[PDB]
Amino acid sequence: LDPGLQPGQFSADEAGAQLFAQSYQSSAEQVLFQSVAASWAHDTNITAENARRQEEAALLSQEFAEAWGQKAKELYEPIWQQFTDPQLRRIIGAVRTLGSANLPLAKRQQYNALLSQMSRIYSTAKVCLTCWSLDPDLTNILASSRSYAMLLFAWEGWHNAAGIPLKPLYEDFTALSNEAYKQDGFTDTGAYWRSWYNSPTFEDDLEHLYQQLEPLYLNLHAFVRRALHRRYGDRYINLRGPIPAHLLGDMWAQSWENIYDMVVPFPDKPNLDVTSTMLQQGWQATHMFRVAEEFFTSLELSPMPPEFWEGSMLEKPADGREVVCHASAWDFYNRKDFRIKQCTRVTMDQLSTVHHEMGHIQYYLQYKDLPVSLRRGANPGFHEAIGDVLALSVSTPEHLHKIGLLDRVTNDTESDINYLLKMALEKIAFLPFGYLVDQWRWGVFSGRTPPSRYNFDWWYLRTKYQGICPPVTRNETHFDAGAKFHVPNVTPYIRYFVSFVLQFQFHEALCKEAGYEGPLHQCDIYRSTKAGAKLRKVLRAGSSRPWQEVLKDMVGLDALDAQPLLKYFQLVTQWLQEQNQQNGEVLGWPEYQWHPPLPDNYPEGIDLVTD
Ligand SMILES: *[C@@H]1O[C@H](CO[C@@H]2O[C@@H](C)[C@@H](O)[C@@H](O)[C@@H]2O)[C@@H](O[C@@H]2O[C@H](CO)[C@@H](O[C@@H]3O[C@H](CO)[C@@H](O)[C@H](O)[C@@H]3O)[C@H](O)[C@H]2NC(C)=O)[C@H](O)[C@H]1NC(C)=O
Numbered sequence: 001l002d003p004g005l006q007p008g009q010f011s012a013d014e015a016g017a018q019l020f021a022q023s024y025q026s027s028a029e030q031v032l033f034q035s036v037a038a039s040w041a042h043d044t045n046i047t048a049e050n051a052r053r054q055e056e057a058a059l060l061s062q063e064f065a066e067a068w069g070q071k072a073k074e075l076y077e078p079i080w081q082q083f084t085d086p087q088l089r090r091i092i093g094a095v096r097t098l099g100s101a102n103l104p105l106a107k108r109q110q111y112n113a114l115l116s117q118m119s120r121i122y123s124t125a126k127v128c129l130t131c132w133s134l135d136p137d138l139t140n141i142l143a144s145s146r147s148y149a150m151l152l153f154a155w156e157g158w159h160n161a162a163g164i165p166l167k168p169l170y171e172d173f174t175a176l177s178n179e180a181y182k183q184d185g186f187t188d189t190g191a192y193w194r195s196w197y198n199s200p201t202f203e204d205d206l207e208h209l210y211q212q213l214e215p216l217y218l219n220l221h222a223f224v225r226r227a228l229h230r231r232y233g234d235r236y237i238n239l240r241g242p243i244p245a246h247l248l249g250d251m252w253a254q255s256w257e258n259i260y261d262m263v264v265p266f267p268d269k270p271n272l273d274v275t276s277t278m279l280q281q282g283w284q285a286t287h288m289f290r291v292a293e294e295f296f297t298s299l300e301l302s303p304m305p306p307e308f309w310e311g312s313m314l315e316k317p318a319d320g321r322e323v324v325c326h327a328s329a330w331d332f333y334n335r336k337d338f339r340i341k342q343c344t345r346v347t348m349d350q351l352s353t354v355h356h357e358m359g360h361i362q363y364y365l366q367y368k369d370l371p372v373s374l375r376r377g378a379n380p381g382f383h384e385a386i387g388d389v390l391a392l393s394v395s396t397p398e399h400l401h402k403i404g405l406l407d408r409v410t411n412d413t414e415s416d417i418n419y420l421l422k423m424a425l426e427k428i429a430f431l432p433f434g435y436l437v438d439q440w441r442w443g444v445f446s447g448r449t450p451p452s453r454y455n456f457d458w459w460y461l462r463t464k465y466q467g468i469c470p471p472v473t474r475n476e477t478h479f480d481a482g483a484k485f486h487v488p489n490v491t492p493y494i495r496y497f498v499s500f501v502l503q504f505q506f507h508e509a510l511c512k513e514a515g516y517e518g519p520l521h522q523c524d525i526y527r528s529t530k531a532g533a534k535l536r537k538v539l540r541a542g543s544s545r546p547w548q549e550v551l552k553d554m555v556g557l558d559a560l561d562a563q564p565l566l567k568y569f570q571l572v573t574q575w576l577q578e579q580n581q582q583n584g585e586v587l588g589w590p591e592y593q594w595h596p597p598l599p600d601n602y603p604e605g606i607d608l609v610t611d
């Protein structure tokens with residue numbers, strides 16, 4: 001470690017710890033910057049050389065964390081918890097958490113290599129018929145094909161190509177990650193991930209939320225399954241069974257807005273998918289980002305700085321090198337550089353993604369002058385929620401009309417049901433997936449799910465929560481969890497479940513603060529400077545204060561609460577219940593063992609339905 005980056009001498013008291021923290025920050029910004037820069041250079045240009053450079057940068061970061069972590073313990077271990085400044089307590093608590101820096105050098109190098117190789121495998125996997133990439137090709141097929149066989153080929157091809165080679169690396173990764181966090185006092189890595197929520201009752205509280213939400217999912221599931229039955233027939237859809245996992249608009253069946261045009265309740269009403277209008281009007285990635293930015297500035301939040309526009313990767317490179325296309329938002333920790341890396345396509349769901357990623361950037365801009373250790377969301381769910389809150393306003397037919405994307409305007413009960421159904425496809429269908437992914441990982445990290453049950457337990461959870469089944473047979477050579485970005489890229493998932501609840505709590509509070517008095521699902525906070533100021537208060541706090549108190553200030557309650565989500569959806573929750581009863585549906589999938597058969601001459605003759 002460079003001399004300038006090494007911890008010096010500080011007194012073993014609170015006053016010294018304050019000086020230690022100031023000195024830590026100064027060097028940490030440099031070390032984080034070089035690491036983030038190196039990761040950027042890799043993710044925007046995946047090469048063995050750029051992986052090597054990123055790995056070298058990670059080792060420097062691990063040296064840094066060890067030096068400053070060991071100094072924090074040497075000086076402050078018996079006393080930091082009784083310090084009177086609560087921000088300082090959080091800074092010291094973060095600095096003394098070493099993570100992968102607890103591993104000796106040889107294991108740090110193994111750990112860092114595993115992360116690179118897992119990232120490379122996921123983001124360069126292809127399905128050959130002429131080979132399809134996940135983004136744009138397989139993504140577009142899953143969203144827009146209504147050919148059972150084409151969808152199947154894409155689903156099976158992707159899961160086999162991405163998942164199979166990840167399995168050995170993922171086992172090795174899990175062991176090293178646990179070894180690392182055990183030395184910070186956690187029984188496994190999952191316990192460390194959960195500790196960010198500072199709640200002894202986290203798992204129970206999530207489970208109690210899920211119980212309130214599940215009836216909404218069950219009704220939405222049955223209604224969609226009926227539509228799929230009438231399209232694909234009794235051979236491929238069991239009205240009392242799980243839905244084939246490839247038919248719901250998305251590679252992971254994680255949200256279903258892409259099959260809205262197959263299930264729309266009232267097809268005589270305005271077309272709420274504005275993608276074709278975006279395309280007719282000549283929208284491009286940059287316009288999508290500029291429109292998102294202008295929503296933020298309407299709330300008196302910050303525009304994107306010149307560094308964002310000059311440095312970001314807003315379209316898939318045509319040159320046409322390998323990249324991590326999975327949308328992400330980047331803080332370089334120098335208070336100047338902030339970037340989005342997205343292979344942006346011109347669709348309505350992508351416009352929401354742009355808002356999602358820009359919400360991350362807005363958080364970074366607002367807390368950039370906090371101590372480095374407090375430049376995080378109040379919890380990780382807060383970070384995920386911000387952009388989604390704005391996107392809820394943007395999605396309203398009234399807002400879409402304001403920005404020239406929805407010509408017809410209407411306020412009748414059928415149009416409301418259509419809108420709420422579209423939003424339920426996007427939000428309610430996600431809830432089980434958002435909840436199950438880290439249930440799977442937590443069991444893997446605890447040892448409850450060994451490698452010999454990776455896939456058995458994944459599909460157990462996939463069926464249990466989502467009521468879906470694989471549309472081809474799977475066995476333990478397959479590693480289908482690995483075919484989802486966040487698994488090989490080691491990004492926790494429970495944040496997204498937390499976010500999908502929290503965002504309705506936020507939306508309700510900002511709508512109230514805007515002085516809006518109509519139905520919650522027709523609120524638009526656009527141009528509300530008061531809404532803006534209430535949200536800014538949250539963003540500026542970073543992780544300086546307990547999330548329960550930040551939430552209480554914002555919404556009047558100190559806990560996650562499903563009621564705002566239930567209130568938003570009430571009309572379609574009722575309508576779906578009625579529809580399913582009239583149709584005599586069974587709610588759930590009591591034929592839990594059911595899987596669809598293969599199509600007749602699959603996969604030969606896929607050439608007849610491709611190009
Ligand atoms: C779409 O239409 C609905 C319904 O409008 C109502 O019913 C129609 C048939 C007409 O008779 C309307 O004149 C009538 O309001 C609108 O929702 C309704 O908005 C009003 C006005 O904000 C709401 O009234 C408020 O409710 C709050 C909460 O209790 C009170 O504190 C306020 O003082 C005020 O009474 C009303 O509750 C709400 N109705 C329902 C059923 O939710 C909606 O605004 C409109 N949307 C658009 C985009 O035009």
Ligand SMILES: *[C@@H]1O[C@H](CO)[C@@H](O[C@@H]2O[C@H](CO)[C@@H](O)[C@H](O)[C@H]2NC(C)=O)[C@H](O)[C@H]1NC(C)=O
Binds near residue numbers: 045047048049050
């Ligand atoms: C993608 O990364 C590679 C490194 O793997 C970059 O290759 C370097 O390119 C510069 C500029 O032309 C050359 O002067 C170097 O000699 C190259 N280095 C190596 C190690 O081969 C490449 O430029 C990157 N591409 C982009 C668009 O950034």
Ligand SMILES: *[C@@H]1O[C@H](CO[C@@H]2O[C@@H](C)[C@@H](O)[C@@H](O)[C@@H]2O)[C@@H](O)[C@H](O)[C@H]1NC(C)=O
Binds near residue numbers: 474
């Ligand atoms: C696991 O499955 C592998 C490939 O899948 C199989 O091939 C398709 C075409 C169908 O026959 C399907 O029913 C099968 O699952 C097999 O090559 C392999 O033998 C299986 N692995 C183990 C360890 O048994």
Ligand SMILES: CC(C)[C@H](N)C(=O)O
Binds near residue numbers: 496
């Ligand atoms: C929240 C969810 C949509 C997440 N961004 C994902 O792509 O998996």
Ligand SMILES: [Ca+2]
Binds near residue numbers: 249255257349
């Ligand atoms: Ca989608």
Ligand SMILES: [Cl-]
Binds near residue numbers: 193196381492
């Ligand atoms: Cl998380």
Ligand SMILES: [Zn+2]
Binds near residue numbers: 357
């Ligand atoms: Zn996010």
